[PDB]
Design a protein around this ligand. Sequence first.
Ligand SMILES: CC(C)(C)C(=O)Nc1cccnc1C(=O)Nc1nccs1
Ligand SMILES: [Co+2]
Ligand SMILES: [Co+2]
Ligand SMILES: [Co+2]
Ligand SMILES: [K+]
Length: 304
Amino acid sequence: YRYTGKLRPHYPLMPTRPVPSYIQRPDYADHPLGMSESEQALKGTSQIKLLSSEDIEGMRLVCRLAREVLDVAAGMIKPGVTTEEIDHAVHLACIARNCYPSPLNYYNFPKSCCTSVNEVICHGIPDRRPLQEGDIVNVDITLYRNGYHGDLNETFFVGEVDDGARKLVQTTYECLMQAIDAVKPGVRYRELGNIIQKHAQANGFSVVRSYCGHGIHKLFHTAPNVPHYAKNKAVGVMKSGHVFTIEPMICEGGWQDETWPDGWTAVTRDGKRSAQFEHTLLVTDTGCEILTRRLDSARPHFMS
Ligand SMILES: CC(C)(C)C(=O)Nc1cccnc1C(=O)Nc1nccs1
Ligand SMILES: [Co+2]
Ligand SMILES: [Co+2]
Ligand SMILES: [Co+2]
Ligand SMILES: [K+]
């Protein structure tokens, strides 16, 4: 395999971390290939669930807990810390909150969260590589509690970073917030991509096309599929009660992506950097509720 940039996987990975049996597990948790029958039982369907009061309270809770766990990871970002150390803390934080770390064994994903450094677009596997000064790293968190999944992610700076990194991360967050600002009943899901690409393109960046936002609730990934690029064929119209994510991945160079031999790590084909931000949203009558919002601060960690 010909790597696209300077990053390389750092094996071996510590033995799989166990989750106490008292924590409720999703269906794929114990599947040999990590397959989700409940999810596949809807694969291909474009119909979108309309959550009930019970579902909404369930989503508000797991999403709040997921934010708490991302904040734990955020406090560990610094030169010298390995992504595996971050994952360990995330794993323990999920357990402490009586939640199962959704990524664990999801289609056999080996860890409890995704850590994506520099050219890694998404799904980076926490490993033995120490974070280096100047790196940017995204931590994507998803928790499962009482049958519901809560999903969010942020890109962080490791020590001081160059202007290019600052601009990429800042623009990516702005893309996310502009998209969220347009969410309300009646808006087509395909519209978000137009908003995102417009801003990314205006700043000299490209939008990843292989991965999209997604519905989430009793399932980790389900309808609707939400592309982040312009003129897409996304199917569906927003309605009060819908819950989904917007998680744009923006790149310094081209948008082309490819996967590492591990079957998960997605990287830019040109080896340039990529950043991402994500929130789980609940469409309301007046717009939308950002279920994964930070509660003790009006801004994401990178502007600190
Ligand atoms: C079923 C699947 C793994 C092929 C899939 O559609 N998957 C998907 C789509 C869009 C975004 N994200 C994912 C995903 O898995 N994300 C993960 N995060 C942590 C472990 S697996
Ligand atoms: Co994912
Ligand atoms: Co996510
Ligand atoms: Co997501
Ligand atoms: K990255």
